[PDB]
Every structure is written in structure tokens, then in C-alpha cells.
Design a protein around this ligand. Sequence first.
Ligand SMILES: *[C@@H]1O[C@H](CO)[C@@H](O[C@@H]2O[C@H](CO)[C@@H](O)[C@H](O)[C@H]2NC(C)=O)[C@H](O)[C@H]1NC(C)=O
Lengths: 215, 106, 97, 225
Amino acid sequence: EIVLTQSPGTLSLSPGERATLSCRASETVSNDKVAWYQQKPGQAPRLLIYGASSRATGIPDRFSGSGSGTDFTLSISGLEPEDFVVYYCQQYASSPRTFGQGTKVEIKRTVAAPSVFIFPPSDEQLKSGTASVVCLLNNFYPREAKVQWKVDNALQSGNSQESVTEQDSKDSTYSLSSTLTLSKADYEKHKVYACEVTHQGLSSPVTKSFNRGEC
Amino acid sequence: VAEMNPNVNVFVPPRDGFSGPAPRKSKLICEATNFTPKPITVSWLKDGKLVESGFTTDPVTIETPQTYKVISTLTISEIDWLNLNVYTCRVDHRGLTFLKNVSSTC
Amino acid sequence: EMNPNVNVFVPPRDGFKSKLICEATNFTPKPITVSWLKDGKLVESGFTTDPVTIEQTYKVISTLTISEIDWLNLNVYTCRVDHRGLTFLKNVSSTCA
Amino acid sequence: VTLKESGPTLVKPTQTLTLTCTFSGFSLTTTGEGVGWIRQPPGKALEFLAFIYWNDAKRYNPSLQSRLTITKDASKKQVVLTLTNLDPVDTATYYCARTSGWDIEFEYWGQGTLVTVSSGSASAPTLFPLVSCENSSPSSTVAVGCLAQDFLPDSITFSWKYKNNSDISSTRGFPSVLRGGKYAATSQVLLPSKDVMQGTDEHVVCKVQHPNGNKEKDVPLPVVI
Ligand SMILES: *[C@@H]1O[C@H](CO)[C@@H](O[C@@H]2O[C@H](CO)[C@@H](O)[C@H](O)[C@H]2NC(C)=O)[C@H](O)[C@H]1NC(C)=O
């Protein structure tokens, strides 16, 4: 059992610069049989380098591998917009083999203030016994953001899944959606529902709330 | 939250409301208050002819249903007023047209 | 430093309560005080002053609430404008009288 | 060299799951060549299931030992994978690849197939109107959305049209999340404020193309002007 840990999980680079990916193994690998893979969301993963030193057919020469033993580093010269995908390091000397956590590289951009909108549940949806309150964040950077739900001054926990979209192809920003789920009987026992959004580019937190019956 | 028909009021200068070099000129004020929703169209009519110049409409400002107010000013000539010309303020609100007619006749 | 123009508007001859509008335009500096008078007596309530807006020239308007009976009884209403130590008084009356 | 996967798109928990990896253009006769299965749950990394070498040599993962079986049929040139004791947390997309020697591992990858393990049934999606309750802050533009709920499997495309059947470019698509055995997704659209204070159209239609029904509910605009 060879445990592979990759760090950092997310790194922000710029086009044309150099990116270094680190791969940490829990023990030495015989014959340095470590390979790197490239995977794009939607499509299928593709092999880039096998054995950490030999490239494969149809792979540009700008990808270079180095290191041995328990330390391996992947260097890429001439970073391209199409190269902002997730990369995994894998070793095939274990039998059975193991895969690493993987690291994601994003395009570095400036901090933009997000937009917060909340949609109260519709009357038709309330008839089904389920109420869904949403909290939408759009056009913010970096991806790291905190979304907390506060209803009647009581902080909620253990009831938010949280969905986040991928980086925009033309805007390079991120968006996420937070959904509040509660029982219909519990919904009628609360008046004000609000989600708090905290951002690096905001001096003070901005809170939005609505009054039951006015929407 | 509510739908209310706008109220149309027209202000006219008095007999001594004209000054300046001859020919003297004055202004007409048409104000709509206690109307909802916020959007509203204000137009000026002179003896059935649309006025396309010499008028300035102030932006709508906020004065429990929400209320708004709008102020419009049209420059008029003393000679036209003396000819018993009738000025009509055209107000459009949610597809409804309200007209008010004023004149110097007693 | 230019003296502000004083104009007082009156309700239409053929009918409309109503409001009285006193306008001061092309005045400088921006600070200006506008008040209302009724038959030579100070008015303590029933009047409001709108914030001064930009038409450099400025425009300020005032609103006075009056009743139909009082206005048509030939009562004297005067708009008082104070600017740079000068006081301007404008008197209006019924035209059809 | 290419590979193609195939199998059921919906399987109940605690049952038998069978997948077939269809490949053509090579034979498992030379040494070093082998076939392996790699799965990846959404939001997670790749997971190694098993690998089979030539001469009927197979390897299994100790974490999943005594739970998977590897069988090969040279007549049909396709490996057969059997999965038992299905669990909702094990839902992932399964891929198969060919190793061209001892050093070149997984040189060619196929396309994969989504195998959803949910106790529920493939019911038609349910739409719910969403009206923004924002106040005291008109901001740049207004936001209106569409809540597609109770759909399985997750395959939905969103298109926005006006009342006069116009075209809108939203491109705002949020991924689905497994909540209570069902996938839930949210979709929104941004429209200019000037258009709202213009045409009399007070609502727009939300359209979803799911292979369980062609319903399309309309969301009424709040209108600000
Ligand atoms: C459907 O109605 C909308 C009204 O909301 C039309 O949008 C207007 O027309 C222009 C030209 O297409 C658009 O670019 C603008 O968004 C709207 N005009 C203004 C002044 O805001 C839309 O065009 C109509 N659809 C079709 C096919 O004509």
C-alpha cells in the first residue's frame, strides 16, 4: 500500500510562466516506475510521461520530468490556457497500483466583488412539503469562499451540500450555489432567512434577507 | 404591490409671472404624485401639437405602498399665452393616458 | 454673484387642494434660504423645501400646501428669498379678480 | 487503438453490476499487455479497482479484495467486469485502458460510461419557479433562475427563451449534487435591466431536455423599471 499525496491542492499560475507539480510517496518505488497523467473534465484522461523520464507519442517536448526515490517534480515550460486541468501522478511498481489525490491549476486573476442573490421558495413548491432557499455567488475570485446560513440568529450546520461550478472559459471567474433545505412545518416557524457571504475583496460582510409573505 | 391611477396637476404663471427682455417667457410645471409603479411617461401638448424642444423632465424621485413623484418643466412664450392657447400635459402609466387642459380663460 | 430670479406659480383659472412653487434659478453660491408668507404673517408649518439640484447654475424649489377656499379669497402670499444679504419679495393674486 | 465501454445506466443497490470493455485492433498475446479498470467519483480522484495480465494472471486491491472478479474472453476480445454489493457512495464512471508494455502504462483510454447506483427510479424532472426577493439594491442587473429537481440520471441541458421565442446566452450551469438519493441542480440567467423596462413580456419560459419528459414551466419576472 503506497499512499500518494499531492500538494498544494489548488495553485494559481499565469500563462507563459513555469508550473511545478509535487508528488509525495509514502515509501520508495522500485526502479522509479512513476508515471504522470493528464485529465480534462468531460473527456478521458491521457498519458503524458511514462517512467517519469520518457515521454509518449503525441506529447509535446515542453513537459519535463525529474527526481527519483520519494521526491518527484513535474516541470512544464510555456504554460498554455488548455493546460489548466487536473494532473495525477501514479506509480505502477506496486501491483496493485495506487493513484494520488491530484492537483488543479487555475488562471490567476484579480479579485472581483461577488453578487449575492436569494430566491425564496415558490408557493407551488411549498405545497409539496419541501422548501428550498438558494444563495447564489457569481463573479468572485479566488475560489475559496465562506457561505454561512443564519436564520432567526441561529447558525445552521450539517444541512448544506454546496455546489460550485468550474472556471469560466472567457471570464476566468468562479460561481457556486448554496441550497437551504428544511421541513415545511419548520419553514412556517421562521420569519427571516439570510445567508452570509464573506469575500477577500469586501471590507465588511454583506447580508441579504427577506420577509415572509412579502414575496 | 399596488396599482393606482396617477394624478395630473398643471401649474401656470400668474398675470405678473412674465419678466425679462421682450418677448417675455415663463415655464409650465406638470407633476404626477402618488402613482405606482415607478415608471411613468410625461409629454407636453400645445393645441394638439407635440412639443419636441424646450422641455426638461426631472428624474423620478421617491416622495405602506411605495410612492414616487415626477416634475416636468416646459418653457412657454408670453405671446402664445395671450392667444388663448391651451396646453395639455400627457401622462402615460401602464398603457393608460391621462390628459389635463388649462387655459387663461376665466 | 448674481441675484436669484424669483417666480411664483398659481393654480389654473378653471380649477385645479393645490401647491405653491417658488423657484430660484441661476443663483450663486449654492446655499440659499426660501420661506413663505401669508398676508404678511410668518408661516410656521405646511411648507417644505426640496434639496438643491444642479441644472455652473443651481435650482431650488419649495412647496407650500394651501386650500382652495383660502387661495381664492384674495389672500396675499409672498415668497421670501434671502441671498448674499439681499431679500426679494414677490406678490401674487388672482388674475380673474 | 481505441476502447469503448458499455453497460446499464441505472442499477439498484445490493445487486450485480456488469460492464463490458470493447476493444479491437490488438490481442492479449504478447507479454506486458494488460487491461485495468479505473473509476473516479465526481469531485474525487481516480480509484484503482483491479488489473489483469496475460496468461490468466489477475491482481486485486486488498481494500476491495474478495469483492470483484475479473474474467476475459479471447473469442469476443472483451474483458468482463462483475461488481457485487453495490453502494451509493461507490457511484463513479468506469474506464478501461491498454498497457503497451511494462513501462508504457495506460497509453490509450476509451470514453467511459456513468453508472448511477440509486435506490430511486428514473422519474421525470420537476421544475419550480424562482422569483428574486432582492430589495433596496437594484445593482447592475436582476437575477432569475429555474430549479430542476428530482431527475435521474444527471443529464440536463438548459436553454432560455423570451416570450416571443428569442435566444438567450446564459451559460450558467451548476453541477448536480446527490441529496436524499436524488440529484438536484440549479440554473440561473442574467438579463439586462434596460430590456426589463421595455417590452410588456412579464415572464420567460424555462426549458429542460431530459429523457424522461418534455415539460417546460415558465418563471414570472419581478419587473423593477
Ligand atoms: C422579443 O422581445 C424583446 C423585448 O423584450 C426584444 O428585445 C428588444 O429588441 C432588440 C432587438 O432584437 C433587442 O436587442 C433588445 O434586447 C430589445 N430592445 C430594447 C430597446 O431593449 C426581442 O428583439 C424580441 N425578439 C425578436 C426575435 O424580435
